[PDB]
Amino acid sequence: QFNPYGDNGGTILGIAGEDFAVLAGDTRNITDYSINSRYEPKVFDCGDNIVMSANGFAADGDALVKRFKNSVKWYHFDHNDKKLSINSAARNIQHLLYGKRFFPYYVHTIIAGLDEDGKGAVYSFDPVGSYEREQCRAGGAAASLIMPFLDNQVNFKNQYEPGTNGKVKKPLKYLSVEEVIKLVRDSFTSATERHIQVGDGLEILIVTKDGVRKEFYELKRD
Amino acid sequence: NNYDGDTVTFSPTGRLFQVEYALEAIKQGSVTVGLRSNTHAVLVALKRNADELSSYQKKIIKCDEHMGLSLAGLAPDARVLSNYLRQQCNYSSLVFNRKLAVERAGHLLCDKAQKNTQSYGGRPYGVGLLIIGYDKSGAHLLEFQPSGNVTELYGTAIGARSQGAKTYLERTLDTFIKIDGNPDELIKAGVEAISQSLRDESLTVDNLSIAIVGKDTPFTIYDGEAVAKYI
Amino acid sequence: GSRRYDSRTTIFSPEGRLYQVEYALESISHAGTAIGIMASDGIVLAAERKVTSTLLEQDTSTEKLYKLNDKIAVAVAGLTADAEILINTARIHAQNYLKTYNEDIPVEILVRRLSDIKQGYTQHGGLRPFGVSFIYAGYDDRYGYQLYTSNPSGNYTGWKAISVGANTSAAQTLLQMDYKDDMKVDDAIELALKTLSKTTDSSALTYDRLEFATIRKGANDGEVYQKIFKPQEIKDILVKTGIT
Amino acid sequence: MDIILGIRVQDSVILASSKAVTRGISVLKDSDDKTRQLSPHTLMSFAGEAGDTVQFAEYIQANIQLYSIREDYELSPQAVSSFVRQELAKSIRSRRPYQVNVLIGGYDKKKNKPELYQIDYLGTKVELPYGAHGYSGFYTFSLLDHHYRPDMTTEEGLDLLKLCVQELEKRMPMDFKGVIVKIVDKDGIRQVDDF
Amino acid sequence: TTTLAFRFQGGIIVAVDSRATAGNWVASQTVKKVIEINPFLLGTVAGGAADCQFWETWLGSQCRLHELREKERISVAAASKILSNLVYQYKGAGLSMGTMICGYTRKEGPTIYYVDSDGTRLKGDIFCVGSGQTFAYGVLDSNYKWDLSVEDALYLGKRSILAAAHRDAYSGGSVNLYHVTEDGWIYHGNHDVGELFWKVKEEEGSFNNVIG
Amino acid sequence: GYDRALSIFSPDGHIFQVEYALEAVKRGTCAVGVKGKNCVVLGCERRSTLKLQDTRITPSKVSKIDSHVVLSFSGLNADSRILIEKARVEAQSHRLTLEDPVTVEYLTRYVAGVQQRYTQSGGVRPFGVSTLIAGFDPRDDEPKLYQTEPSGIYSSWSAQTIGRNSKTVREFLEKNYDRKEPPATVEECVKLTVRSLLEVVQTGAKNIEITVVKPDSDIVALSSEEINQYVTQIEQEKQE
Amino acid sequence: DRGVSTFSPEGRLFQVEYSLEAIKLGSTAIGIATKEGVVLGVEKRATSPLLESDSIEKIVEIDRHIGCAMSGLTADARSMIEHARTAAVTHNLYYDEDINVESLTQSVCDLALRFGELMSRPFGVALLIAGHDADDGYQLFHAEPSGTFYRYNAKAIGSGSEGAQAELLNEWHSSLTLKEAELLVLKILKQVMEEKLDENNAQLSCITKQDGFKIYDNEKTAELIKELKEKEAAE
Amino acid sequence: TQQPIVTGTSVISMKYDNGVIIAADNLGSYGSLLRFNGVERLIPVGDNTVVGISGDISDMQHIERLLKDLVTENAYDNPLADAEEALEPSYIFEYLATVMYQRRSKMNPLWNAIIVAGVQSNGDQFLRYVNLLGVTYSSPTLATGFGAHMANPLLRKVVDRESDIPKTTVQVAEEAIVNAMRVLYYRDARSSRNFSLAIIDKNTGLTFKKNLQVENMKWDFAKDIKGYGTQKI
Numbered sequence A: 001q002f003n004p005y006g007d008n009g010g011t012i013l014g015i016a017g018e019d020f021a022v023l024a025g026d027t028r029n030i031t032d033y034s035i036n037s038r039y040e041p042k043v044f045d046c047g048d049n050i051v052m053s054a055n056g057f058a059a060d061g062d063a064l065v066k067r068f069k070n071s072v073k074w075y076h077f078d079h080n081d082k083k084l085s086i087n088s089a090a091r092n093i094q095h096l097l098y099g100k101r102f103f104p105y106y107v108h109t110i111i112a113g114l115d116e117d118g119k120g121a122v123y124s125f126d127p128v129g130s131y132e133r134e135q136c137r138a139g140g141a142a143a144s145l146i147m148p149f150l151d152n153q154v155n156f157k158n159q160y161e162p163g164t165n166g167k168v169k170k171p172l173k174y175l176s177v178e179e180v181i182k183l184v185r186d187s188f189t190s191a192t193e194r195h196i197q198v199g200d201g202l203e204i205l206i207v208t209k210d211g212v213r214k215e216f217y218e219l220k221r222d
Numbered sequence B: 001n002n003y004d005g006d007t008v009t010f011s012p013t014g015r016l017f018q019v020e021y022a023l024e025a026i027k028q029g030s031v032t033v034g035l036r037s038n039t040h041a042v043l044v045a046l047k048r049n050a051d052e053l054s055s056y057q058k059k060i061i062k063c064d065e066h067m068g069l070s071l072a073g074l075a076p077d078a079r080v081l082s083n084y085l086r087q088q089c090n091y092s093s094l095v096f097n098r099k100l101a102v103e104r105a106g107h108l109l110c111d112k113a114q115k116n117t118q119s120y121g122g123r124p125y126g127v128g129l130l131i132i133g134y135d136k137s138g139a140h141l142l143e144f145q146p147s148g149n150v151t152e153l154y155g156t157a158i159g160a161r162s163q164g165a166k167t168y169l170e171r172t173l174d175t176f177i178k179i180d181g182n183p184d185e186l187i188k189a190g191v192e193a194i195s196q197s198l199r200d201e202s203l204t205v206d207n208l209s210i211a212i213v214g215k216d217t218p219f220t221i222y223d224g225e226a227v228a229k230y231i
Numbered sequence C: 001g002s003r004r005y006d007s008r009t010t011i012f013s014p015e016g017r018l019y020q021v022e023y024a025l026e027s028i029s030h031a032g033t034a035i036g037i038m039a040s041d042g043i044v045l046a047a048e049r050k051v052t053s054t055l056l057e058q059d060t061s062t063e064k065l066y067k068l069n070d071k072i073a074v075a076v077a078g079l080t081a082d083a084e085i086l087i088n089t090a091r092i093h094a095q096n097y098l099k100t101y102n103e104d105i106p107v108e109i110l111v112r113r114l115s116d117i118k119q120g121y122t123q124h125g126g127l128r129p130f131g132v133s134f135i136y137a138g139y140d141d142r143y144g145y146q147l148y149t150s151n152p153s154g155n156y157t158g159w160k161a162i163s164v165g166a167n168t169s170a171a172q173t174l175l176q177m178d179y180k181d182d183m184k185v186d187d188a189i190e191l192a193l194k195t196l197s198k199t200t201d202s203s204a205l206t207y208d209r210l211e212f213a214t215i216r217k218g219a220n221d222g223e224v225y226q227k228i229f230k231p232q233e234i235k236d237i238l239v240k241t242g243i244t
Numbered sequence D: 001m002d003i004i005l006g007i008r009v010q011d012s013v014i015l016a017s018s019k020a021v022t023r024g025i026s027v028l029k030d031s032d033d034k035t036r037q038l039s040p041h042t043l044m045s046f047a048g049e050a051g052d053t054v055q056f057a058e059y060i061q062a063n064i065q066l067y068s069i070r071e072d073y074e075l076s077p078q079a080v081s082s083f084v085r086q087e088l089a090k091s092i093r094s095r096r097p098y099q100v101n102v103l104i105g106g107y108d109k110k111k112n113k114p115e116l117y118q119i120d121y122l123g124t125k126v127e128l129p130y131g132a133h134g135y136s137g138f139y140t141f142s143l144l145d146h147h148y149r150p151d152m153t154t155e156e157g158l159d160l161l162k163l164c165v166q167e168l169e170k171r172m173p174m175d176f177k178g179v180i181v182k183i184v185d186k187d188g189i190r191q192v193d194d195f
Numbered sequence E: 001t002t003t004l005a006f007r008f009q010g011g012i013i014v015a016v017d018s019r020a021t022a023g024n025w026v027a028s029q030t031v032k033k034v035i036e037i038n039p040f041l042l043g044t045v046a047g048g049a050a051d052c053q054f055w056e057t058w059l060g061s062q063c064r065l066h067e068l069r070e071k072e073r074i075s076v077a078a079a080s081k082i083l084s085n086l087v088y089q090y091k092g093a094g095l096s097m098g099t100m101i102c103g104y105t106r107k108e109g110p111t112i113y114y115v116d117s118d119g120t121r122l123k124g125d126i127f128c129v130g131s132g133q134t135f136a137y138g139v140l141d142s143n144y145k146w147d148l149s150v151e152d153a154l155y156l157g158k159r160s161i162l163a164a165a166h167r168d169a170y171s172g173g174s175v176n177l178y179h180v181t182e183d184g185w186i187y188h189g190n191h192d193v194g195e196l197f198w199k200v201k202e203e204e205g206s207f208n209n210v211i212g
Numbered sequence F: 001g002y003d004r005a006l007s008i009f010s011p012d013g014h015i016f017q018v019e020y021a022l023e024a025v026k027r028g029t030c031a032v033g034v035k036g037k038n039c040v041v042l043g044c045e046r047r048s049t050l051k052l053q054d055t056r057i058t059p060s061k062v063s064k065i066d067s068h069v070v071l072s073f074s075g076l077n078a079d080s081r082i083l084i085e086k087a088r089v090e091a092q093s094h095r096l097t098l099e100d101p102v103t104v105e106y107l108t109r110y111v112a113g114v115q116q117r118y119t120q121s122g123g124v125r126p127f128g129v130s131t132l133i134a135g136f137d138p139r140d141d142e143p144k145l146y147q148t149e150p151s152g153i154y155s156s157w158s159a160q161t162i163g164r165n166s167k168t169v170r171e172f173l174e175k176n177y178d179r180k181e182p183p184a185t186v187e188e189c190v191k192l193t194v195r196s197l198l199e200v201v202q203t204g205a206k207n208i209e210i211t212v213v214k215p216d217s218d219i220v221a222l223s224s225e226e227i228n229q230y231v232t233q234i235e236q237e238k239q240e
Numbered sequence G: 001d002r003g004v005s006t007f008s009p010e011g012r013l014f015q016v017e018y019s020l021e022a023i024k025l026g027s028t029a030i031g032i033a034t035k036e037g038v039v040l041g042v043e044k045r046a047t048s049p050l051l052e053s054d055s056i057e058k059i060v061e062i063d064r065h066i067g068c069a070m071s072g073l074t075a076d077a078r079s080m081i082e083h084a085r086t087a088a089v090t091h092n093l094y095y096d097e098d099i100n101v102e103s104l105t106q107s108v109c110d111l112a113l114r115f116g117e118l119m120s121r122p123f124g125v126a127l128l129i130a131g132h133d134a135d136d137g138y139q140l141f142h143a144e145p146s147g148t149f150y151r152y153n154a155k156a157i158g159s160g161s162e163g164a165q166a167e168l169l170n171e172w173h174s175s176l177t178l179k180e181a182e183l184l185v186l187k188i189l190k191q192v193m194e195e196k197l198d199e200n201n202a203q204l205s206c207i208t209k210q211d212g213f214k215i216y217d218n219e220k221t222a223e224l225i226k227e228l229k230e231k232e233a234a235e
Numbered sequence H: 001t002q003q004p005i006v007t008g009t010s011v012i013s014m015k016y017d018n019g020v021i022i023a024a025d026n027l028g029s030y031g032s033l034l035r036f037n038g039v040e041r042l043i044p045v046g047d048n049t050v051v052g053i054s055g056d057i058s059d060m061q062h063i064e065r066l067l068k069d070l071v072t073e074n075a076y077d078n079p080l081a082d083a084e085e086a087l088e089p090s091y092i093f094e095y096l097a098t099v100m101y102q103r104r105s106k107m108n109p110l111w112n113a114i115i116v117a118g119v120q121s122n123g124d125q126f127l128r129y130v131n132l133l134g135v136t137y138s139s140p141t142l143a144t145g146f147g148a149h150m151a152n153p154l155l156r157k158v159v160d161r162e163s164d165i166p167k168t169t170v171q172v173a174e175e176a177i178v179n180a181m182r183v184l185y186y187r188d189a190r191s192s193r194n195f196s197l198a199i200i201d202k203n204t205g206l207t208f209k210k211n212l213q214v215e216n217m218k219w220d221f222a223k224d225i226k227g228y229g230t231q232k233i
């Protein structure tokens, strides 16, 4: 019988700073035990300082990004070139995803950008439209490997202040763009080591008030 | 007389009076000018107001990053047609990953307006449009009429007293066509062209409306203090 | 287009009347007179056939009086063809009600639905109304014996005695004169015939130019019987009352 | 939903209906009234699939109330039951049938007689002296076969009903949290508060 | 999930956990399971996350349209029935929703309505909904009285979620407290189980099963 | 389907079909609504050119929409049935979804909306009917009286009349009805309603119908003798 | 007869032009936009003294940040308001934000020309849509049955429109306060109204960023009427 | 819901310095039966694109007709149909990619794997894949079916990343393709010796080669192999 879904693998990662936000994702594309492409980008600039990635089943992922990109376009036409805020984009995406509640997009979606106060924002979605703003999210095949590492290093979970008898927690603080990119690169190299569907290359999209900048790094090709 | 009740009726001399009355709505509309070079295309539109307390009716509409039009006549009909163009431009992008040709844009509008002139119940569109764009074959300027007749031109104008601007452009043809790689000078030629259609009134800051598209210029509209440069 | 040829059947006059309903009533006023008279122990339906020919088969004929179910009957005035469309609808509606509730349909409910159908033709659809007026004669266990009338407007009203069709003005005056509330069926039979005999446009009222029916509780113990009179039975009742 | 009983006596109809609403391993509510008043002298108890029960009961209630307003007249218990049966008879051959079983207890004011109808989700109507839906019947029918008499009073009917509830509380596996009892007679519908 | 809400002398307490699960994977620890429909209406959510999130936000829109049209705040009964009639249309399609519509109006007073995805709609004084509802019931029922103070009621609601957060593997993260009065709902803060557990253990002397 | 735009604008800015529908209302038998301190009374004219009628079965002029709301009308009788039926269905639908009976304002708003829809829908003519909708909101003792008309406008009235010679009875009510002090009791309200109809009717025999609506679904229709007592009392006081 | 969507020889739609005549017969409605808020005021015009004037609802809420006043065949406005309210709430559901006043007006005006041989005729009512958003601030729009809408600093529609519009021309300036605007609506309404202006036959409302859209009570409007009369007599 | 009947096997392709190469054998298999031997599975669109199709042949012939019809439709009211407004590989691909995904979304897929090879108007090499699921991806080397498992490894030794493309000549690239076709003939049980090859160069244009054969095959070592273990004779 025909199976309409497939697993194109890979993994994505979003981290929010004080006045910036990053959305990273490996450039490997796979089916079963074969590599399809070593460089197939899945993190996209969608305009209005919103970056998006829909990892999982690439056909559904590309379809969704394509529709959201088009949703941004018609938002400008219908509302006098108004800028789509990140919170509004998120809600719009929920309706796109839930629109196919009974024949879902097989993708874990993550968008990143800046909120209306100029602060870094990462929103993350399930396959049917459930969403939540966070400082931190990993999505895709190696999400289970990366996510707990982020809890520890970004949100300082299970870390207490030395000599306080485990009474005072390590205080929460924003990370610099330099420190965030270090965590991203270490997250992806670690995920590449232990997950077969992750590797080849890493592409990071950084979002500041100035615009959207890109950075590329090599990953192990085995 | 007896042959103007609806669009489905021909006159004894072979005329469609409802289409001609729709054409009349354009002549009542405010003047707008279109002109192009080989690098850029420019729309200049005189906006109209109800009174001093009212705003000035927006004449120019964007269809895509590389295409847009100005209107003269019934504004709601222009909204319907511009929306149709937006969808057709967008269909070409999503399906074929291809920017819609300005010539096809005209062909599609012609065929849409035509269907309204041959069927009972419906009515002709009561608006004229000037479509500008930059595609794979350079800059373009189209003139749409609700009869269905679309025409590609170097320059033109439609609306009330549009004959003044149209004569000027017919004289200036050789000059403005060669304004290549210079947006501001092409706009100046368009602002001088629309000035030939003015009576009593002159071009003010919230009266004038200018749009431009070109080689390395997306379709962008200029209103308010942004057009003060050209007065 | 087609707009040119539209009569616009469902519109108001400047005075606030429905042209087609009014003209349909003018049509009905030329139809053979039909009379209904409700007594304490039954109902009478009498109707005059439209200018009969001597070669018309009289015994196997049905022009004026129709049976809707075992308990309800109607007298027609207007276009017969139109009436038959409405009658078959009414017959079906009665059977739907019986199928749904396992109870015979109350007279008013049937009358309302049939009147609602006529109303629809005056308000929407762009069709001509039904050129028909009914006299409903029926019985149920709520209100007992009931007489109603409906006309092309879709408006219906209840009556003790009523006429439709031709010469209703003259007929209604005569009924209003001789009718009284403690009346019996046999008396109502006589009144119905006497009224037709005086309001008729014919020279003399005869058996072959009449349809007649009664709805009595004259069956055995607490049950209703419909009697559509035969030609010979009309001939006898006409002699018995002393008209011929 | 589980236990709904009905007992027609001389001058009234008595409907008992369990109070428990269970879902999974949790009794969510122990005071649930599994009935609706269709008209002043007609009461319908119901049991079956979750959601369907109330949705159906209220839909019927609305229709009967609409009839009452239109005609300014109360429909007979027989007529209401026939209407209900037809609705279930349509339902069973639908895309998604109502899975609801009902008892219709009513007092016919024209006949001056109490009437009890049992209708299952298929649209199977029967008039009975006593009725039950679900597993309840497997105990109560035989019990009533023995103890029921047609000429009983309402008070005798309630004692007969107590005898059923006691037997069910003894032998039924599930805790149904007692019953709400309602009486339908010439004076209308009233609830027995202490049972 | 574990969500509860109970009626008492001083209004309504509403308490929820904040965990989201994708099987045994902990999807989130910081999710919002109380939707603020208006200043007088709350909606708790358990079950399918998107189903809950989407349709409860939708419910808020329908409640807004009601007060625009009727110039009057929607009743708790009417609001709950809009949602229950909606999910009933989708019955069989596979929606998963365990909600509790809690609020106050003049005509009704404090009211709680349990509504779930198979069409059940129940008015009641106490409800617990979710994978850890039984654990919450155990603590809540054994300590519940109508005459509880606002201070004690808030704590009991918090302690009942904590109990479930502990035992139920598919509940936890943090406790979100609310208190509904005649004047409207009042938020009583987010309480992380990471700190709250040890705070409760020490002060209350409970949770002796755990290695202290 | 029949599509024709029957209700349309004319050069002077009038929709003649809606205005001609008002003429049908003006032809209709008079109907009056007077609301007191704790009640509303609906009076209705019945033309006396129809004898040999059966008043048991003849459709009554005042119709119950729900147990707490009533609707009388003036104009085309057949049309009124369609509005009443729709209103009755909507009343049950409201109880089903909101778990609360309709307010008199809501029911009126619905009926008026239906009437309006027929003034700009293709293939249909406007309702030749104006209504007086009266009653009491659930758990409320404040009397409500509303009026609708073919165009679709509706509004609340302390007292109001519609139908033939309504301008005469409206003239009567305008001077006789005091806003500061409405009819304190049921008797006072009914008397004022009968008095107002006696300006127009002809005879106070079987020509006047009266229906009294009180709070908590307390509606009752007066009989001939009960109404005749008011007629007898008013005429004796008049001779002065 | 003749088609519904027919053009005149002058190039206008007959039915649209006739519907404008209906709006001229309607009761007066005035709107004034300031930097402190937008004020909307209407003439109630009760046809009889027995009619309870508080039931006359010619000013209407669309959302918390958008109000609406009407004039003409006011029964036709019901479906326009319903659409507007749904559009406003629907946009909030899709985008988690307030909807722009212009976008709302445009949505309403899209219904206007959806008539022909869709509904059978144009609307016989004009709307004054007042509101506020974060982008363009306080705005007043005039929505016609032609499908056209103009933004206004101030606008009068209805029977006394041309007389009131000429008065608004002179009186309006860009530094008007809210209190000044309130009185200015009352002043101009009293001039064009047939009957004498009071709290029962005229209604005021406003929309501010802070408090949103609010219809004024008869007690509040009465004080503004009394304040208005005193200020005119004071010079 | 389909099942493929008459099927075509591997389509292999790669980029080189000035353009792209694509190849596919001429077999139409009917399960294990090698039914049809004259099947062309490379279909040129204009003079700048070649579409290579594997999978169900009936669906391939449908796609042929769609492309044939696309050229016609593009020519309508288009004076620049053979110039600026000619069909690009990227236009042709996106069209097919749209169709493939729409069909899978209606649970009625075109049971194919497609590779659109061509050269754009600005001289850029175009090479992109799409299949029955609507999955799309691009790479210096692309292959379908067994090609993905056996050809790609060999072709990636030539062009392992983007920077290797300018360093690869048409002679080297074609040799790698022809070698890959031989390896597939050795090891793919539903392949044939006869095949077609197409080269789309930005300078020399479209070169379509028919009736090629796999040659220089190593079979001589077979004679020494006796039995399956312990046999000597």
Ligand SMILES: *[C@@](C)(CO)[C@](*)(O)[C@H](Cc1ccccc1)NC(=O)[C@H](Cc1ccc(OC)cc1)NC(=O)[C@H](C)NC(=O)CN1CCOCC1
Pocket (backbone or CB within 6 Å): A104, A126, A127, A128, A130, E001, E002, E019, E020, E021, E022, E023, E027, E031, E032, E033, E045, E046, E047, E048, E049, E050, E052, E053, E094, E095, E096, E130, E131, E170, E171
């Ligand atoms: C507890 C944690 C039980 O898991 C709660 O019910 C919690 C409630 C909740 C409410 C709002 C926001 C987040 C969480 N429910 C979940 O976390 C929920 C559990 C669940 C999963 C699948 C179900 O099948 C219908 C039912 C319940 N988890 C999710 O919804 C997760 C985040 N999403 C998915 O698993 C995506 N699936 C959902 C079903 O459709 C296919 C995709």
Ligand SMILES: [Mg+2]
Pocket (backbone or CB within 6 Å): A221, A222
């Ligand atoms: Mg490997």
Ligand SMILES: [Mg+2]
Pocket (backbone or CB within 6 Å): E164, E165, E166, E167, E168, E169, E170, E171, E172
């Ligand atoms: Mg746990």
